[PDB]
Design a binder for this molecule. Structure first.
Ligand SMILES: CCCCCCCCCCCCCC(=O)CSCCNC(=O)CCNC(=O)[C@H](O)C(C)(C)COP(=O)(O)OP(=O)(O)OC[C@H]1O[C@@H](n2cnc3c(N)ncnc32)[C@H](O)[C@@H]1OP(=O)(O)O
Ligand SMILES: [Cl-]
Ligand SMILES: [Mg+2]
Length: 385
């Protein structure tokens, strides 16, 4: 469209296109001393609020905000419903800054009507590793849309990130903004076929009857990798080597420390599931997926769609297809109705044989203040929450 806000930012214009040989900031030589020390101005009657995600009640307010006002599907049927424990995990990774968890209250009601967050992560883009912020959970109450609050939230979190001498960010969105480094479609694998049908997530046809669909998606309750088990603390060193080594082949990925691997992969029920295969004290395969339910809007039978989202999967003792089949089984065993994945890393290679269906959106990946060539999503090696 016009991108009146985005055009003022150090991000590519719609028709910018860079060679593989360009891989650098739009704006370099930035100085912490020059960063604005004043908070951005909000409309009258609204105030900044620093959220303490560790405090159950502040976390609860964020939770209510996103539950009522966060991302809905292309047809307004489902609304994503990140749990409060999920937020706690997502926002308190190693070395996180409380002051990057930013709310906006309406002064008269004392209610949170806006939120944006970031966490620090080292990102390797085209072989250069840069300290970045990973921005997520941008949300404006539905009653306050199209009033230019989001640019205020964006400019304010940028200011706070810059105060820590960080000048790049990574973020994703389902909407097209200037200008994606990569673009990955959603694919879905039906587990609880009948419920997906009944809530309008999937459909049948005259050559696919209900029973024939249920048979189509039926899975054998037996693992290809028989020793796949929930990750424990003892496996942190092993997962660090297995996943770290794997990721280096990609054009975009997080560079995890051991403390980050423990955070991101140690299991938390109804948040993060990590399974590992250990063989001679070495971790040789891993599977992981996170829990992101959607509230089902106005349905008398079901309130919640239980979805698993593929996170990081690595095999050295089986095929990729066999490892993903085990992923679908582990998600079934943990009561999920559907397993979702993006066409990143090696994932697209197994979607046809494992009976994934193409979804409606795509997820665009973005860098702030970074000029580089775009690339196919098989070359993406990071999955944001
Ligand atoms: C060095 C550090 C740098 C740190 C920061 C890096 C950048 C981080 C950027 C953030 C990444 C977050 C990633 C993320 O959390 C995950 S992607 C999901 C974002 N959240 C949702 O979609 C939830 C439901 N929607 C809303 O709450 C509102 O519709 C939001 C708040 C989305 C926009 O509220 P609104 O009431 O509809 O809109 P106005 O206030 O009037 O604002 C219009 C301006 O906002 C631009 N816009 C719209 N959606 C966007 C989006 N998803 N990213 C970036 N920009 C987006 C839009 O293009 C326009 O600018 P333009 O006029 O130039 O087009
Ligand atoms: Cl400004
Ligand atoms: Mg607004």
């Amino acid at each position: 469209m016009d991108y009146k806000f985005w055009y003022t930012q150090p991000v590519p214009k719609i028709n910018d296109e860079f060679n593989e040989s360009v891989n650098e900031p739009f704006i370099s030589d930035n100085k912490v001393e020059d960063v604005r020390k004043d908070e951005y101005k909000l409309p009258p009657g609204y105030s900044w609020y620093v959220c303490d995600v560790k405090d159950e009640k502040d976390r609860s307010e964020i939770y209510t905000l996103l539950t009522d006002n966060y991302v809905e599907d292309d047809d307004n049927i489902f609304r994503f419903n990140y749990s409060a424990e999920f937020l706690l995990w997502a926002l308190t990774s190693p070395n996180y800054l409380k002051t990057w968890h930013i709310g906006v209250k309406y002064d008269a009601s004392n209610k949170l009507i806006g939120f944006i967050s970031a966490i620090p992560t080292d990102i390797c883009i085209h072989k250069r590793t840069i300290k970045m912020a990973e921005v997520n959970f941008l949300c404006v109450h539905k009653t306050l849309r199209s009033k230019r609050l989001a640019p205020v939230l964006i400019k304010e979190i940028t200011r706070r990130i810059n105060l820590e001498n960080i000048w790049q960010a990574i973020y994703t969105a389902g909407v097209y903004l200037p200008k994606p480094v990569s673009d990955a479609r959603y694919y879905h694998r039906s587990i609880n076929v009948k419920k997906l049908i009944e809530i309008g997530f999937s459909s049948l046809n005259s050559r696919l009857t209900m029973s024939r669909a249920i048979k189509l998606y039926r899975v054998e309750d037996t693992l290809n990798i028989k020793n796949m088990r929930l990750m424990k603390k003892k496996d942190v060193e092993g997962v660090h080597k297995l996943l770290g080594s794997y990721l280096e082949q990609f054009n975009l990925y997080a560079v995890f420390t051991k403390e980050e691997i423990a955070h991101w992969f140690l299991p938390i029920e109804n948040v993060i599931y990590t399974y590992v295969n250990e063989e001679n004290g070495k971790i040789k395969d891993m599977i992981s997926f996170y829990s992101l339910p959607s509230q089902i809007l106005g349905n008398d039978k079901y309130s919640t769609l239980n979805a698993a989202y593929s996170f990081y999967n690595v095999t050295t003792t089986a095929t990729f297809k066999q490892l993903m089949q085990d992923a679908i089984l582990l998600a079934k065993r943990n009561n999920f109705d559907v397993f979702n994945a993006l066409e990143v890393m090696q994932n697209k290679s197994v979607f046809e044989d494992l009976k994934f269906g193409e979804g409606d959106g795509s997820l665009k990946y973005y860098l702030y203040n970074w000029k580089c060539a775009s690339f196919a999503p098989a070359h993406v090696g990071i999955v944001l929450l």
